[PDB]
Amino acid sequence: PMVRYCSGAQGSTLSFPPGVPAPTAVSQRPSPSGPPPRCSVPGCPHPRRYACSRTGQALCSLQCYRINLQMR
């Protein structure tokens, strides 16, 4: 149960014994999305500040919230 760390002449080395929790892990890049989300109203080109509650659609401001409320 000994974790060995050797700073040798040829280079560093970190060893892990059998069955050690080997905390050393890896990482990756999650896939990104191309277009950012947009306001659900087709006329409004602003991005999604938030999503509505009563009906559940992307919204930007007071005007588009009122538009979505009226059109439903």
Partner 1 sequence: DVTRIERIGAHSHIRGLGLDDALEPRQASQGMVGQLAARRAAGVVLEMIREGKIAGRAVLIAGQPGTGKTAIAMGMAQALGPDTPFTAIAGSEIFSLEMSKTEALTQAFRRSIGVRIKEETEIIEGEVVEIQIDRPATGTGSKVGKLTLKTTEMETIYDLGTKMIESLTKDKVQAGDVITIDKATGKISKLGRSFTRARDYDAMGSQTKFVQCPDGELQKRKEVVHTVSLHEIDVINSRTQGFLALFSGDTGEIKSEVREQINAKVAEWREEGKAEIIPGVLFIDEVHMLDIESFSFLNRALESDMAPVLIMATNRGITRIRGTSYQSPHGIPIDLLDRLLIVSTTPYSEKDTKQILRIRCEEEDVEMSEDAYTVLTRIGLETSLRYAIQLITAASLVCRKRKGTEVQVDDIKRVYSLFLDESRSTQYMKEYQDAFLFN
Partner 2 sequence: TQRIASHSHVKGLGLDESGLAKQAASGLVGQENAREACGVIVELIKSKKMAGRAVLLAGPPGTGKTALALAIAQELGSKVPFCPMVGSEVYSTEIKKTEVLMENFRRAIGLRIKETKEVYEGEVTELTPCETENPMGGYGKTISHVIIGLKTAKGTKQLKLDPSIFESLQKERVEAGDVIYIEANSGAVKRQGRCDTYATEFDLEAEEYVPLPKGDVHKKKEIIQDVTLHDLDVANARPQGGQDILSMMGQLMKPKKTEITDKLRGEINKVVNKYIDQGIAELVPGVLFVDEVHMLDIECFTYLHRALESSIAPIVIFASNRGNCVIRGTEDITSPHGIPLDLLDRVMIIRTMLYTPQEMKQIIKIRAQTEGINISEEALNHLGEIGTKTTLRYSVQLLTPANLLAKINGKDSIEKEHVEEISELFYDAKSSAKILADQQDKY
Residues lying near partner 1 in the complex (CB under 8 A) = 1-12, 17, 20, 49-50, 61-62
Other beta carbons within 10 Å of 4:
9
Q: How far is the CB of 37 from partner 1 (least distance, A)?
A: 15
Other beta carbons within 10 Å of 39:
21
Say which entry of Zn ion, partner 2, partner 1, none residue 44 contacts (CB below 5 to 8 A, set by partner kind). Zn ion
**Residue carrying the six token digits 């559940």:** 56
For position 44 contacting Zn ion by CB under 5 A, the verdict is: yes
For residue 64, count CB atoms less than 10 angstroms from its CB and return exposed for 0-12, middle for 13-18, buried for 19 or more: buried
Binding site for partner 2 (CB under 8 A): 4-5, 11-20, 22-30, 32-33, 36-37, 47-51
